[PDB]
Amino acid sequence: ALFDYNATGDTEFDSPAKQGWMQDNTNNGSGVLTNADGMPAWLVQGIGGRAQWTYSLSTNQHAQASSFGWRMTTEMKVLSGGMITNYYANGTQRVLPIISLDSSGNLVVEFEGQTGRTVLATGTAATEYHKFELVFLPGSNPSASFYFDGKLIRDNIQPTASKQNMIVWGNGSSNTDGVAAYRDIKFEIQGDVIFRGPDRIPSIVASSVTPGVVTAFAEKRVGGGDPGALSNTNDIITRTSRDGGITWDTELNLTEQINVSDEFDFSDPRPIYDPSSNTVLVSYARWPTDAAQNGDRIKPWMPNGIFYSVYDVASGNWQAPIDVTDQVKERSFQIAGWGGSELYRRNTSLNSQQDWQSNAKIRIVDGAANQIQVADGSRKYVVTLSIDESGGLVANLNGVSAPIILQSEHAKVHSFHDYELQYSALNHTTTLFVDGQQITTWAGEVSQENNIQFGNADAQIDGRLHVQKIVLTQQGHNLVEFDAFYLAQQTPEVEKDLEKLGWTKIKTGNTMSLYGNASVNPGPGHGITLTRQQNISGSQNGRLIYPAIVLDRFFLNVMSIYSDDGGSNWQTGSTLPIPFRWKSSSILETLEPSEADMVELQNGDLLLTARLDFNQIVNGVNYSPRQQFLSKDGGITWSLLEANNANVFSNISTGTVDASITRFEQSDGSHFLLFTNPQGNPAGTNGRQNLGLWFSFDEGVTWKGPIQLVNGASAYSDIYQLDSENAIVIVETDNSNMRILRMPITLLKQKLT
Ligand X SMILES: CC(=O)N[C@H]1[C@H]([C@H](O)[C@H](O)CO)O[C@@](O)(C(=O)O)C[C@@H]1O
Length of the chain as a residue count:
753
Q: Which of 226, 290, 435, 699 is catalytic?
A: 226
- Min dist CB 24 to ligand X, Å, is 8
Q: Does 90 bind ligand X (CB under 6 A)?
A: no
749: three-class secondary structure by DSSP:
helix
- Stretch binding Ca ion (CB under 5 A), from 158-166, 225-233, 310-318, 564-572: 225-233
- Stretch binding Ca ion (CB under 5 A), from 207-215, 461-469, 652-660, 668-676: 652-660
Instruction: Kindly calculate the radius of gyration of the chain based on its CA atoms and give it in whole angstroms.
Output: 32
The footprint of Ca ion on residues 157-186 (CB under 5 A) is none
- Min dist CB 175 to ligand X, Å, is 6
> Which of residues 90 and 348 has its CB atom nearest to ligand X in the complex?
90
d(CA 362, CA 384): 11
- Min dist CB 173 to ligand X, Å, is 3
Single-letter amino acid, residue 545 = I
Binding mask 17-36 for ligand X (x = CB under 6 A): ---------x----------
Cα distances (angstroms) measured from residue 433 to each of 329, 398, 441, 542, 583: 26, 16, 9, 34, 42
Task: Identify the residue among 75, 192, 265, 458 touching Ca ion (CB under 5 A).
Answer: 265
Q: Does 702 bind ligand X (CB under 6 A)?
A: no
127: three-class secondary structure by DSSP:
helix
Three-state SS string across 264-276, please? Answer: EEEEEEEEEEECC
Tell me which of Ca ion, ligand X, none is bound by residue 289, counting a contact when its beta carbon lies within the kind-specific cut-off of 5 to 8 angstroms. Answer: Ca ion
Strand locations in 224-278 (E): 233-241, 252-253, 264-274
> Which of residues 172 and 593 has its CB atom nearest to ligand X in the complex?
172
- Min dist CB 25 to ligand X, Å, is 9
> Which of residues 164 and 352 has its CB atom nearest to ligand X in the complex?
164
Q: Does 525 bind Ca ion (CB under 5 A)?
A: yes
Tell me which of Ca ion, ligand X, none is bound by residue 422, counting a contact when its beta carbon lies within the kind-specific cut-off of 5 to 8 angstroms. Answer: none
- Min dist CB 482 to Ca ion, Å, is 27
Consult the annotation and say whether 611 binds a ligand: yes
Q: What is the number of the residue whose Cβ is closest to ligand X?
A: 173
Phi, psi of 462 (to 5 degrees): -65, 145
Strand-by-strand arrangement of the 93-95 sheet: 22-23, 51-55, 166-171, 87-89, 93-95, 160-161
3-state helix, strand, coil split of the chain in percent (to 5) is 10, 50, 40
Is 718 labeled as catalytic in the residue annotation? no
The footprint of ligand X on residues 35-64 (CB under 6 A) is 50
Give the residues after which the backbone of the chain is interrupted, taking a C-to-next-N distance over 2.5 angstroms as a break.
none
Task: Identify the residue among 16, 172, 178, 573 touching ligand X (CB under 6 A).
Answer: 172
244: left (phi over 0), alpha (psi -120 to 50) or beta: left
Total residues binding ligand X (CB under 6 A) = 7
Is 226 labeled as catalytic in the residue annotation? yes
- Stretch binding Ca ion (CB under 5 A), from 226-234, 409-417, 633-641, 703-711: 226-234
Tell me which of ligand X, Ca ion, none is bound by residue 662, counting a contact when its beta carbon lies within the kind-specific cut-off of 5 to 8 angstroms. Answer: none
Consult the annotation and say whether 688 binds a ligand: yes
16 cis-preceded (ω within 30 degrees of 0): no
Q: Which of 515, 562, 716, 720 is catalytic?
A: 716
Q: Does 263 bind Ca ion (CB under 5 A)?
A: no
- Min dist CB 214 to ligand X, Å, is 36
Provide CB contacts within 8 A for 227, sequence distance 6+. Answer: 219, 234, 265, 266, 267, 285, 287, 289, 292, 293
Tell me which of Ca ion, ligand X, none is bound by residue 26, counting a contact when its beta carbon lies within the kind-specific cut-off of 5 to 8 angstroms. Answer: ligand X
609: enclosing H helix or E strand: strand 606-613
> Which of residues 67 and 176 has its CB atom nearest to ligand X in the complex?
176
Q: How many Cα atoms sit within 13 Å of 298 on the Cβ side?
A: 29
Strand locations in 457-605 (E): 463-474, 477-482, 504-509, 512-515, 519-521, 528-529, 544-551, 556-563, 571-575, 580-582, 588-590, 592-600
Q: Does 173 bind ligand X (CB under 6 A)?
A: yes
Single out the residue of 659, 739, 668, 738 nearest to residue 706, CA to CA.
659
- Min dist CB 81 to Ca ion, Å, is 52
Catalytic (active-site) positions: 226, 595, 716
Per CB under 6 A, residues contacting ligand X are: 26, 50, 85, 172-175
Give the residue ranges of the annotated binding site for substrate: 200, 611, 688
Per CB under 5 A, residues contacting Ca ion are: 229, 232, 262, 265, 289, 296, 524-525, 554, 597, 658, 660
